[PDB]
Design a binder for this molecule. Structure first.
Ligand SMILES: *[C@@H]1O[C@H](CO)[C@@H](O)[C@H](O)[C@H]1NC(C)=O
Ligand SMILES: *[C@@H]1O[C@H](CO)[C@@H](O)[C@H](O)[C@H]1NC(C)=O
Lengths: 52, 52
């Protein structure tokens, strides 16, 4: 009795998963100056629009 | 700025009023207009004081 592994199919699956991961992980956009997202007072409709 | 006050009061969710005793020396308080008729006599806004 014996057991063994197949390398070609294993490598194909690993390569596809690694391609997906490389397409997802590490790609990030840069945003520098944006609007205020926390407020200490209430002032009306402009702050409401920003929150919305 | 009507919209800001409307939004602020709507978000507050109450009309609770506590009466304070301002000094208001040397003037005539209350004051009534013919446009606001409460019952049969002239009146004014209930929560605002017209100083004359
Ligand atoms: C209101 O004004 C009068 C003016 O004579 C003063 O004597 C009194 O202390 C004042 N009251 C308050 C509560 O500030
Ligand atoms: C104004 O009217 C109110 C309600 O009747 C009363 O409490 C207050 O003393 C009046 N102020 C005056 C007469 O100066």
């Amino acid at each position: 009795r014996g057991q063994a592994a197949d390398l070609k199919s294993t490598q194909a699956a690993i390569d596809q998963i690694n391609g997906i991961l490389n397409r997802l992980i590490g790609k990030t956009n840069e945003k520098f100056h944006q609007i205020e997202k926390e407020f200490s007072e209430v002032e009306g409709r402009v702050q409401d629009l920003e929150k919305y | 700025d009507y919209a800001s006050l409307r939004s602020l009061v709507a978000s507050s969710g109450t009309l609770e009023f506590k009466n304070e005793s301002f000094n208001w020396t040397g003037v005539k308080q209350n004051g009534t207009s013919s446009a606001c008729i409460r019952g049969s006599s002239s009146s004014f806004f209930s929560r605002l004081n017209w100083l004359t």
